Amino acid sequence: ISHGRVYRRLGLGPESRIHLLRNLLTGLVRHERIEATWARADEMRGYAEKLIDYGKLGDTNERAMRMADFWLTEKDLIPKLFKVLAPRFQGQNGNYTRMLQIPNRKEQDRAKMAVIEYKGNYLPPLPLPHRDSNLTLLNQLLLGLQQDLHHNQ
Amino acid sequence: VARYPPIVASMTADSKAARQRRVQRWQATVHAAPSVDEKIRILTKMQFK
Amino acid sequence: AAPKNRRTIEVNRCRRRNPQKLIKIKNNIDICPECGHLKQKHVLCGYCYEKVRQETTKIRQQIGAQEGGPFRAPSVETMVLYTGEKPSEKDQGKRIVERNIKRPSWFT
Amino acid sequence: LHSKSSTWWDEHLSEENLSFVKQLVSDENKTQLTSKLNPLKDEPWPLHPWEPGSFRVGLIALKLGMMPLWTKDGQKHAVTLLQVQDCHVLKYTPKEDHNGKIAALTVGGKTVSRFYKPDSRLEFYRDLGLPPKQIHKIFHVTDNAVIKPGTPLYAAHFRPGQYVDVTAKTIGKGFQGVMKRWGFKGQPASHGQTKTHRRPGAISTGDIARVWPGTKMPGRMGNQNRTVYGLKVWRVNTKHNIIYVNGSVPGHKNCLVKIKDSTLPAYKDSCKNLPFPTYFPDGDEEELPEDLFDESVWQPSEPSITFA
Amino acid sequence: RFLSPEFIPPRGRTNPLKFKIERKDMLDRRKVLPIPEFYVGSILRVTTADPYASGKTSQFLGICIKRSGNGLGATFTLRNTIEGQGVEICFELYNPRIQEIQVVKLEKRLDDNLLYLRDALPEYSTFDVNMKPVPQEACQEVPVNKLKVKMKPKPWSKRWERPNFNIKGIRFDLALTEEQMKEAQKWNKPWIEFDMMREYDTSKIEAALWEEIEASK
Amino acid sequence: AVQKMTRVRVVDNSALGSTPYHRPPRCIHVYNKSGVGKVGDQILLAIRGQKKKALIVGHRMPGSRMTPKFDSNNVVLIEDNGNPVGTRIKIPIPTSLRRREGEYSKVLAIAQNFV
RNA sequence: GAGCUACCUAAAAACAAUUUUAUGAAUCAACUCGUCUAUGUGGCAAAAUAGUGAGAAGAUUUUUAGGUAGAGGUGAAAAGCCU
Ligand SMILES: [Mg+2]
Ligand SMILES: [Mg+2]
Ligand SMILES: [Mg+2]
Ligand SMILES: [Mg+2]
Ligand SMILES: [Mg+2]
Ligand SMILES: [Mg+2]
Ligand SMILES: [Mg+2]
Ligand SMILES: [Mg+2]
Ligand SMILES: [Mg+2]
Ligand SMILES: [Mg+2]
Ligand SMILES: [Mg+2]
Ligand SMILES: [Mg+2]
Ligand SMILES: [Mg+2]
Ligand SMILES: [Mg+2]
Ligand SMILES: [Mg+2]
Ligand SMILES: [Zn+2]
């Protein structure tokens, strides 16, 4: 009976879970694109989004600095969070991270894998799933339906 | 008025940079020893080949 | 508790060939438009993704040389330029990573 | 491959048409629902008077939550909130074709999406002219109380002072041991017990050399249909169609429940003073107040209760 | 702008409509009876009608030690010692038989829960029954009483020294040796305060409610 | 919630409940079909090598809202006939004793303070 | 066959801190032992683990080499130990 609980049980315990997640978050901020097991990447996605919000609060905020200090073990990253990532995501209200499933791991444990990144990074674009064009057969028929309904009141 | 933490390596991590910081921690004890005997004792107490 | 009787191959064949124990056939396998290799509908193409990361490793390798050591991450945005490209006015005051190869067609 | 492939509604939709389809489906839901607002003007089936031994149709409601309620005597009653959402009569079976003793009506509530449903269910609703509903339940209704399919049902069907029966699936607790499932005592924690603390004791006696059918054993608990009998109705909110029911109702919040007049012998014939087929807002002989109260209930905004 | 705690919805999967229905009843009662602003640690006098008696009310004075409950079910507990006997009553704010709620002394305390006053000396829980209300100043902040009470011998109702309770209003030095404070910190769970998914932001929710309450007025 | 072997406080002016013989009286029996004793429930008391009836007038266990939760388990000694052993009670007594089923008027006459 | 174990011979070793009438004294490590409980029961182990406990300057513990052999040896006698 684990109804309503919003966390995975990871690592050696609750504290170990935080540290495992913290290490992934630290890697994500530095490199902006990280591969982990799909479950662990999903666990860390929420923290990645909330960290940007703390960065938006501002450099001078004391709580933001303490939060940034705890989560970014490599302390050179803290300037990056407040002066690079937060300015980038000023317009958005959320959805800063992009997470997609990668083919399973070829390492005899066949782990389910994911790629987690921050949006807007400098790295080569991921091969995202592109929806079909309006020129396809089904789309054109729907486009015809849309035009008639809009034009005819 | 932003108090960024200093950009230094971890004290406890298993890395080369972290170990070097632990080296400086031990060496500071020598710098802070008033007597010449303590400085020699600290500098020579650990035996290796 | 220990077995009272040997289990016959007739019983055993019913256990290990029951449909519940068989490998399910997958209906979500599709062919990738760009590379022409196989993929699952909900999963990224492994061939195309393989191209992206290996280019990423090349970029990150160049980054490591420029920084030269740990704890040297910039406080300004980064940008990657390939041979035959020069920083624009908007590119001013941003770390530039230089790659010997030409700009990949897919990378823009 | 010349083989079967899996598809979903969004697979071949472009970004532009992806939003268009959602608006198109949402628009149709509104049109169909409005078309059914006026039943009396749509060839209603003949209206019959109430007579002893009659059974009306029931409703399907969503379980909102609980709150405290006070009566003019100062006693506090925990009450559960039941909201009727898109309750409509869907299908009618005559007395002969369902059960010789009584007729049946199928009533559905809680409009749901049309995208991940079997075509058979979608075909059923298309003829009926309604959007699909999450749950169907069957109500035994006497012939005089039969209602035409497609007729909207509202919370004002019930009235305060009326006792009612609620049935829903209980909260699912998964596989459980005998201590939690059947209230077994277990075994002592200390004094030498070797790996026996929450276990069943002896299954049966040795003489019969077997285990009796129905023996209480560890297994999956909850997620079963259960009924609560004789819950009073304290108040009804006409604007939002909320029924206030005494006590607890099986299931979790946001779960659909089946509500019908109580079958207890004491409340044998309560339909005498209730809308006999159902309550029709279309008639609007007198527009109902926003909130209907039971006499004992102490309404908010009343003066403080002094036991004078 | 002081928003009463009960109005804040707790996180969960409940529909927001359930809260709108409850708020309408809550605000309607507040029109009939005025519920004053108060915090844990403030002294309150509550007048309630006794069902046992006939048209005869009762008054209880005590320090508020806990606030709990949301919606129409909100409650508060206030404590006092009467002829040397400690008594606590848990009061439902919206119970129809509460005639009046009077904030004899409005003040705030270092901790938002004062259940440790059961283990503190009797003086810290005794309050004069007939004490008259003290004046309050609108153009001020609520006074934050920083009293740190003295505890009685170590056997306590709870292990208040333990980090989970997070007690900041007890003189632990007088009652506990430095080793015992060290031994307590083994329960510290330091990571709790720094994990961002355990924090419920009610700023926007509190904001939207404020105008809604004011708008109805 | 008074049980068997619970230590209780004699809130009365009776001789048997005085502080001499510090050993607190202990409950031998609860006169309920359940063995749990709440406010208004009689109990049998082991006091000074004697067996005496007592009536629970307060206890530390949380009850229903709007009712007083005390800091000690209080009792009043009751004679076999039912007359209270002591003639005065000074500690507050909950008013709920009035309505609940039983014979409690005699005790309420003895107690000045109600809370 | 005494590289285990029992006892002995020779040559060696270890014992912090804290108190004490100055020691087969006290508190308690290292070290030696193995009280009680749970686990384990083809186990990590053909006797262990985890806690909890006993002694801990002595009739103490430990190392190296030698000695006593079955009608026997050794034994602060458990008819215990001698691969
Ligand atoms: Mg879950
Ligand atoms: Mg209740
Ligand atoms: Mg479950
Ligand atoms: Mg038990
Ligand atoms: Mg056990
Ligand atoms: Mg048989
Ligand atoms: Mg306790
Ligand atoms: Mg030897
Ligand atoms: Mg020594
Ligand atoms: Mg000694
Ligand atoms: Mg000892
Ligand atoms: Mg000793
Ligand atoms: Mg010996
Ligand atoms: Mg013998
Ligand atoms: Mg013998
Ligand atoms: Zn591809």
Q: Tokens 């276990």 belong to which residue?
A: D199
Query: What is the spatial distance, in angstroms and rounded to an integer, between the CA atom of B4 and the C1' atom of G62?
Result: 59
Q: Is E84 exposed, middle or buried (0-12, 13-18, 19+ CB in 10 A)?
A: exposed
Smallest Cβ–Cβ distance between F95 and the set E52, E75, E86 belongs to E52
Q: Tell me the three state secondary structure of residue A65.
A: helix
CA of B47 to C1' of G9 (A): 39
CA distances (Å), C81 to each of C74, C94, C100, E24, E118, in order?
A: 17, 11, 9, 62, 70
Contact A60 B10 (CB under 8 A): no
Q: Of D64, D56, D55, whose CA–CA distance to D110 is shortest?
A: D64
Q: Helix (H, G, I), strand (E, B), or coil: what is residue F60? A: coil
Which A-chain residues 47-86 have CB contacts (< 8 A) with chain C? Answer: 74-77, 79-80, 83-84
**Residues 6 or more apart in contact with residue C12 via CB below 8 angstroms:** none
Task: Mention every residue, 6+ apart, whose C-beta is less than 8 A from residue A41.
Answer: A24, A34, A35, A99, A114, A115, A116
Contacts (Cβ under 8 Å, ≥6 apart) of F115 = E60, E82, E87, F68, F92, F93, F94, F95
Task: Give the single-character DSSP code of B13.
Answer: S
Q: Is the CB of D190 under 7 A from strand G?
A: no
CB of A140 within 8 Å of any CB in chain D?
Answer: no
Residues 147-186 of E with CB under 8 A from F: none
Least Cα separation, residue C71 to chain B (angstroms) = 7
> Among residues F62, F73, F110, which one has the least CA distance to residue F88?
F110
Distance E7 CA to G71 C1' (A): 102
Is E53 at the interface with chain F, CB within 8 A? yes
Query: Using the CB atom, is residue D194 less than 7 Å from strand G?
Result: yes
Q: For A130, which DSSP code?
A: P
Residues of D near E (Cβ–Cβ under 8 Å) read: 64-65, 67-68, 70, 73-74, 76, 81, 83, 237, 240, 242, 253-254, 298, 300-308
Which residues line ion ligand 6, judged by CB < 5 Å? Answer: D 208-209
Q: Which nucleotide in the DNA or RNA is closest to residue D191, CA to C1'?
A: G37
> Which approach determined this entry?
cryo-EM
> How far does residue E179's CA lie from ligand 11's centre (Å)?
24
Beta strand residue intervals within chain D, DSSP E: 59-70, 76-84, 87-93, 103-111, 133-141, 152-153, 163-169, 174-176, 219-221, 225-237, 242-246, 256-261, 291-293
F27 has which bridge partners?
Answer: F45
Nearest nucleotide over every DNA/RNA strand to the D196 CA, judged by C1' = G38
Nearest to B7 among A60, A65, A76 (CB): A76
Strand partners, D260: D165
C99 with C83: CB under 8 angstroms?
yes
Strand partners, E47: E59, E100
Nearest CA distance, E71 vs chain D (angstrom): 8
C14 is in an annotated binding site: no
Q: At what angle do helices B36-44 and B16-31 cross, to 10 degrees?
A: 150
Answer left, alpha or beta for residue D265, where phi above 0 means left and psi between -120 and 50 means alpha.
alpha
Which is it for strands E108-109 and E144-145: parallel, antiparallel or unpaired? parallel
- Whether the Cβ atoms of residue A99 and residue A43 lie closer than 8 Å to each other: no
Alpha carbons D73 and E51: distance in angstroms, whole number: 8
Output the CA torsion D109→D114→D116→D122 (10° steps).
80
Q: Is the CB of residue D58 less than 8 Å from the CB of residue D135?
A: no
The angstrom resolution of this structure is 2.8
Spatial CB neighbours of F113, under 8 Å, sequence gap ≥ 6: E82, E83, F89, F90, F91, F92, F93
A3 alpha carbon to ligand 1 midpoint, in Å?
A: 6
The number of residues making up chain E comes to 217
**Would you call E47 an interface residue with chain F, using a CB distance cutoff of 8 Å?**
no
Phi/psi class of residue D3: alpha, beta or left (left: φ > 0; alpha: ψ in -120 to 50)?
Answer: beta
Query: In chain C, what residues touch B9 (CB-CB under 8 Å)?
Result: 70-71
Q: Touching check for C26 and chain D: CB below 8 Å?
A: no
Strand G contact with D14 (CB < 7 A): no
Alpha carbon E204 to its chain's center = 23
Strand boundaries in B1-49, DSSP class E: none
Contacts with C67 from chain B: Cβ below 8 Å:
none
Residues of A in Cβ contact (< 8 Å) with E194: 18, 66-67, 70-71
- Cβ atoms of F2 and F74 closer than 8 Å: no
Integer Cα distance of E198 and D26 in angstroms: 36
Q: In whole angstroms, how far apart are CA B29 and each of A134, B11, B15, B33, B37?
A: 73, 16, 22, 6, 13
Tell me the C-alpha distance between F95 and E59, whole Å.
13
Q: Which residues contact D261 (CB under 8 A, 6 or more apart)?
A: D55, D56, D58, D158, D162, D163, D164, D165, D267, D270, D271, D274
Nearest Cα of chain E lies from the Cα of F71 at a distance, in angstroms, of: 5
Pairwise CA distance, residues A69 & A83, whole Å: 15
Residue with tokens 């009046």: E100
Say what angle helices A62-71 and A38-57 make with each other, to 10 degrees.
Answer: 150
Contact E99, D305 (CB under 8 A): no
* Nucleotides in chain G near protein beta carbons (<7 Å): 37-41
- CA E168 and chain centroid, separation: 16
Question: Is residue E154 within 8 Å of E92, Cβ to Cβ?
Answer: no
Q: How far apart are CA E15 and CA E13, in angstroms?
A: 7
Q: Which of C61, C90, C63, C93 is nearest to C77 (CA)?
A: C93
Which chains, if any, share at least 3 CB pairs under 8 A with chain E?
A: A, D, F
Q: How far is E196 from chain A (nearest CA, A)?
A: 6
Spatial CB neighbours of A76, under 8 Å, sequence gap ≥ 6: B7, C71, C72, C73
